[PDB]
Amino acid sequence: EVETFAFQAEIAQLMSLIINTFYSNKEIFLRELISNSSDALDKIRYETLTDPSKLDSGKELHINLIPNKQDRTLTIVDTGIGMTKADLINNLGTIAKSGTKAFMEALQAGADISMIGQFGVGFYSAYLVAEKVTVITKHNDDEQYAWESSAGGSFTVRTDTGEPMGRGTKVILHLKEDQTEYLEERRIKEIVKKHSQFIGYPITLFVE
Numbered sequence: 001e002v003e004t005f006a007f008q009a010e011i012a013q014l015m016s017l018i019i020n021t022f023y024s025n026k027e028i029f030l031r032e033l034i035s036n037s038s039d040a041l042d043k044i045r046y047e048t049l050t051d052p053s054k055l056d057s058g059k060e061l062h063i064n065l066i067p068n069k070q071d072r073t074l075t076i077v078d079t080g081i082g083m084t085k086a087d088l089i090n091n092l093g094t095i096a097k098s099g100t101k102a103f104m105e106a107l108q109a110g111a112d113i114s115m116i117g118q119f120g121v122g123f124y125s126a127y128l129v130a131e132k133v134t135v136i137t138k139h140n141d142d143e144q145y146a147w148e149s150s151a152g153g154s155f156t157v158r159t160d161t162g163e164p165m166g167r168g169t170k171v172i173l174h175l176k177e178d179q180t181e182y183l184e185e186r187r188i189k190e191i192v193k194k195h196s197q198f199i200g201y202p203i204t205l206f207v208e
């Protein structure tokens with residue numbers, strides 16, 4: 001049913017840093033997530049140039065932003081390449097260990113948390129605004145899985161028989177009580193325009 005894993009130490013330390021460091025410019029989490037979706041979309045596109053059957057699981061390549069004020073969630077959905085169970089456990093397809101080391105050295109040398117995505121671990125910026133993060137993913141080579149973590153040094157993985165998605169990745173941000181501004185249409189639009197203005201795939205902001 002539900003397997004429980006420990007974060008590697010360097011990632012545990014990364015997440016604590018994200019959670020505990022005073023840092024006002026939290027909005028960058030959205031750019032880091034959209035940028036991950038854009039990379040996964042690039043990968044499926046590239047693979048389909050030589051094998052168009054990789055798109056049998058869906059031809060449209062796009063990103064949906066879905067705010068839900070009742071559940072207090074902001075969900076980012078892409079139809080990118082998705083992740084296998086293995087990628088998920090291996091820090092969501094990141095080089096999180098070396099990238100964390102590089103990020104923490106930069107933070108010495110003068111960097112601030114906004115540059116996180118330069119070290120390949122921009123996912124973890126979700127913890128600027130979310131108390132809990134659920135990642136649902138479907139890669140053509142595997143079943144649908146849900147990854148989940150409220151930080152605290154551990155994460156879980158289970159098969160998801162919730163609502164099949166076809167192919168891609170869904171990041172559900174259960175927002176901290178004081179970060180509900182990221183559910184406001186005006187606010188999301190501003191941020192996307194500010195930081196995600198040239199992404200090569202349509203980004204659709206859902207209405208409530």
Ligand SMILES: Oc1cc(O)c(-c2[nH]ncc2N2CCNCC2)cc1Cl
Binds near residue numbers: 033036038041093171
């Ligand atoms: O927010 C995401 C969105 C995604 O589409 C993915 C994903 N799906 N397939 C590969 C990936 N990535 C993109 C970022 N780099 C690791 C692997 C991962 C994450 Cl964490």
